[PDB]
Amino acid sequence: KITLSDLPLREELRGEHAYGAPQLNVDIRLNTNENPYPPSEALVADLVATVDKIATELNRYPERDAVELRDELAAYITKQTGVAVTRDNLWAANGSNEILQQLLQAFGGPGRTALGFQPSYSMHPILAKGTHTEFIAVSRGADFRIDMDVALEEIRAKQPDIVFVTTPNNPTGDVTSLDDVERIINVAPGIVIVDEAYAEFSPSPSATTLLEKYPTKLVVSRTMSKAFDFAGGRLGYFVANPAFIDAVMLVRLPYHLSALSQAAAIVALRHSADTLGTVEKLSVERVRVAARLEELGYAVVPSESNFVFFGDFSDQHAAWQAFLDRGVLIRDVGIAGHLRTTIGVPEENDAFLDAAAEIIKLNL
Amino acid sequence: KITLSDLPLREELRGEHAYGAPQLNVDIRLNTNENPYPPSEALVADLVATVDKIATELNRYPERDAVELRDELAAYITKQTGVAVTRDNLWAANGSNEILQQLLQAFGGPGRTALGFQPSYSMHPILAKGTHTEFIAVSRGADFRIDMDVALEEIRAKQPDIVFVTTPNNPTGDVTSLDDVERIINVAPGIVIVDEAYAEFSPSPSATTLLEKYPTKLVVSRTMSKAFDFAGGRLGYFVANPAFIDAVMLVRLPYHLSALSQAAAIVALRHSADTLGTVEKLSVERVRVAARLEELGYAVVPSESNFVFFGDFSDQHAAWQAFLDRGVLIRDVGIAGHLRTTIGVPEENDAFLDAAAEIIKLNL
Numbered sequence: 001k002i003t004l005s006d007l008p009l010r011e012e013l014r015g016e017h018a019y020g021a022p023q024l025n026v027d028i029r030l031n032t033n034e035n036p037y038p039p040s041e042a043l044v045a046d047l048v049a050t051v052d053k054i055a056t057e058l059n060r061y062p063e064r065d066a067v068e069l070r071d072e073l074a075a076y077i078t079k080q081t082g083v084a085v086t087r088d089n090l091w092a093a094n095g096s097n098e099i100l101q102q103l104l105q106a107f108g109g110p111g112r113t114a115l116g117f118q119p120s121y122s123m124h125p126i127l128a129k130g131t132h133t134e135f136i137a138v139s140r141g142a143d144f145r146i147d148m149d150v151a152l153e154e155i156r157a158k159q160p161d162i163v164f165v166t167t168p169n170n171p172t173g174d175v176t177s178l179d180d181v182e183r184i185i186n187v188a189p190g191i192v193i194v195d196e197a198y199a200e201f202s203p204s205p206s207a208t209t210l211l212e213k214y215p216t217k218l219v220v221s222r223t224m225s226k227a228f229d230f231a232g233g234r235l236g237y238f239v240a241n242p243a244f245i246d247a248v249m250l251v252r253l254p255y256h257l258s259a260l261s262q263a264a265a266i267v268a269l270r271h272s273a274d275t276l277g278t279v280e281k282l283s284v285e286r287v288r289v290a291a292r293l294e295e296l297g298y299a300v301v302p303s304e305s306n307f308v309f310f311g312d313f314s315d316q317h318a319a320w321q322a323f324l325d326r327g328v329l330i331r332d333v334g335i336a337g338h339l340r341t342t343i344g345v346p347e348e349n350d351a352f353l354d355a356a357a358e359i360i361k362l363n364l
Numbered sequence: 365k366i367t368l369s370d371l372p373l374r375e376e377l378r379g380e381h382a383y384g385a386p387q388l389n390v391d392i393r394l395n396t397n398e399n400p401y402p403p404s405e406a407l408v409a410d411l412v413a414t415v416d417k418i419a420t421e422l423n424r425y426p427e428r429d430a431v432e433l434r435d436e437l438a439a440y441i442t443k444q445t446g447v448a449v450t451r452d453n454l455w456a457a458n459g460s461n462e463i464l465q466q467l468l469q470a471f472g473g474p475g476r477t478a479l480g481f482q483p484s485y486s487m488h489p490i491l492a493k494g495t496h497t498e499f500i501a502v503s504r505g506a507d508f509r510i511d512m513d514v515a516l517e518e519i520r521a522k523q524p525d526i527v528f529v530t531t532p533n534n535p536t537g538d539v540t541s542l543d544d545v546e547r548i549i550n551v552a553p554g555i556v557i558v559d560e561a562y563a564e565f566s567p568s569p570s571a572t573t574l575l576e577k578y579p580t581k582l583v584v585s586r587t588m589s590k591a592f593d594f595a596g597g598r599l600g601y602f603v604a605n606p607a608f609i610d611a612v613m614l615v616r617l618p619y620h621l622s623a624l625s626q627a628a629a630i631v632a633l634r635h636s637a638d639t640l641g642t643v644e645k646l647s648v649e650r651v652r653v654a655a656r657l658e659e660l661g662y663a664v665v666p667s668e669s670n671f672v673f674f675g676d677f678s679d680q681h682a683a684w685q686a687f688l689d690r691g692v693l694i695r696d697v698g699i700a701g702h703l704r705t706t707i708g709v710p711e712e713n714d715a716f717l718d719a720a721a722e723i724i725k726l727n728l
Contacts, residue, residue: 002579002580002605002607003607003610004607004610004611006580006607007471007555007580007607007608007611008471008525008553008554008555008580009470009471009611009614010470010471010473010476013470013611013614013615016614017614018613018614018616018618019618021618023425023427023428029424032424032425034423034424034425035423036423037423038420038421038422038423039419039420039422039423043419044416044419044420047415047419048412048415048416048419051411051412051415052408052412054596055403055407055408055411055412056402056403056408057402057596058403058593058594058595058596058597058628059398059399059400059401059402059403059593059594059595059596060393060396060398060595060596061396061398061589061595061596062595062596062598063387064384064387065387094458094617094620094622095617095619095620097617097618097619097620098617098620101617105374105494106373106374106377107371107372107373107374109374109496110474110496112374123618127617130469130615130617132473132474132496161372189372190372191371191372215366215370216366216370216371225425229422229423230422230423231422231423231424231425231426231619232421232422232423232424232425232426232622232623232624233422233622233623233624234426234619234620234621234622234623241366243366243367243368243370243371244371246368247368247371247373247377249382250373250377250380250381250382251377251494253458253459253461253462253465253491254383254384254461254487255459255461255595255598256458256459256461256462256598257598258458258596258597258598258622258624258625259596259597259598260596260597260622260624260625260628261622261624261625264422264624
């Protein structure tokens with residue numbers, strides 16, 4: 001018998017743990033910011049017909065540069081954000097995880113650093129470390145929003161190669177205004193990745209509007225996993241100056257996007273009008289969930305996303321388990337006193353709110 | 365409009381070029397070692413029916429550890445190679461490319477070295493460089509087979525962290541015997557990755573037979589892209605001791621494999637006997653094609669896979685263009701004097717041979 005210690009693993013990986021956010025198939029899943037609506041019957045029918053069409057070519061490598069997908073992503077972005085862009089501005093990969101991985105390979109890596117404003121996305125420091133990019137954590141303010149004075153101070157001092165700005169922020173829910181983003185971009189010496197995973201849930205404009213002004217610095221990261229109700233298709237993308245697409249083509253694995261993934265994403269995008277109608281339903285439930293939590297006595301952080309950050313427990317993890325014992329799976333992001341609940345369909349939110357009503361009395 | 369030089373791209377990527385065969389819409393495509401047979405109607409019908417079933421779950425993240433897929437991959441390997449394995453021995457990713465990338469992340473990387481036997485697969489050094497692993501090229505012999513005295517000498521001298529052995533080799537087609545593989549393993553200090561992408565095309569035993577004997581050293585890399593007739597699905601995997609699965613779980617992107625990828629590979633696996641029946645036809649066609657090339661007066665390296673390496677042109681790129689002009693797309697693998705043709709269906713091979721006969725008279 002042998003174990004991992006008997007293998008020539010890289011030393012810095014010793015004692016590490018695999019990213020392991022709970023993935024459980026329970027009845028009430030409010031833990032991964034997934035859109036709670038199953039894909040529409042129309043979408044599914046289209047998907048089934050498309051697979052029937054393209055299945056006979058699955059012996060061949062897919063189209064390497066995903067041109068058709070990128071055309072449709074650029075058409076979406078043009079309509080969605082109002083900024084005219086073409087496939088030359090767009091690059092797709094297997095989720096934002098791989099998008100970001102590729103950007104880190106090309107613009108981070110050994111000898112370089114990435115700066116983020118914590119608490120933010122769990123994956124950013126994980127991907128940074130995974131690409132041998134040093135991660136600098138700069139703390140957000142007491143209200144969980146970016147503290148601009150410290151932000152600009154620290155960027156000036158450290159000259160980071162990459163700066164992450166997540167807006168709306170996961171886990172806190174707040175939008176960093178475009179004027180603040182410009183301020184960040186102007187002190188940034190290398191590139192700035194604006195992670196717009198939740199943009200569709202905010203009325204506020206996309207950082208894509210800033211791309212004309214900062215071609216050499218700005219990349220806008222997006223995904224189909226959240227508002228677009230397609231996390232299982234693993235499709236993330238960025239919008240930037242065409243030079244950046246040339247950049248990532250040097251590091252991307254050839255044929256990194258399969259034929260079914262490209263075709264599935266295309267089908268999804270041509271059903272966007274109906275699907276994105278879920279964003280409106282979710283925003284109404286968010287307002288209701290947040291209101292009710294406040295009414296109960298919870299400290300609720302205002303949000304422009306599909307989730308709510310709320311506290312203040314003495315032990316968030318015990319609180320988290322207490323929700324789970326009542327069939328409600330939310331998220332413990334390892335921030336003292338707080339948990340993140342994803343907005344579900346009404347009946348899931350009712351179950352979460354019923355659990356939360358009972359749990360506040362426990363004083364956990 | 366800006367230049368790549370205006371972006372802060374890492375310096376080693378400066379003046380580099382993107383990898384990949386030209387995507388040319390020709391009648392006879394014999395450039396990427398794809399199985400030329402379309403997926404069977406039985407497989408396609410199963411796929412479509414399965415998509416109809418799972419598509420309703422696509423708003424959720426896919427099963428992260430790909431347990432079902434790995435179960436079926438283990439079943440396939442057990443039957444195919446005669447070595448009893450389970451899912452604990454199997455790991456799947458988006459192509460062999462991602463599999464090798466992940467192995468290089470965990471066992472190669474900054475400060476470490478990979479060693480290969482050139483000419484072999486183009487992506488081994490490319491992936492090495494992309495993961496900041498130093499690549500050591502050791503020349504194969506005049507017969508394009510591994511020169512074992514030179515191989516063992518250089519492994520002892522260099523003490524490389526990773527050794528690549530591709531068998532059958534791409535682009536030359538030769539099998540390195542398991543006895544020679546064993547000798548390499550015994551001098552190799554770190555890990556040995558046996559790239560068995562074309563294993564199914566040879567009756568010779570798989571290196572999976574050596575796994576029980578060298579558990580801390582050996583990983584057998586495999587794919588569904590070639591004999592398994594499923595390159596469009598981008599599914600590669602490895603067979604190894606379960607400690608290796610623990611290792612790559614520290615470096616893989618979570619949810620790296622999509623719901624559709626997983627489900628489609630599962631469908632493909634349960635149609636394996638029918639699909640892999642095509643190997644017989646292709647192995648006999650290879651012999652026909654290679655024999656006719658020698659009749660014509662070409663220099664052919666003996667192959668045991670679905671392609672044939674041949675020469676000796678004064679300018680093989682010009683020879684490549686002549687084939688293209690006659691409607692036949694083969695591969696210029698960057699080796700002076702030689703080109704690599706994939707074995708197609710009989711009518712495709714006939715066209716390749718017709719063109720090859722005109723071209724030899726041109727003395728290119």
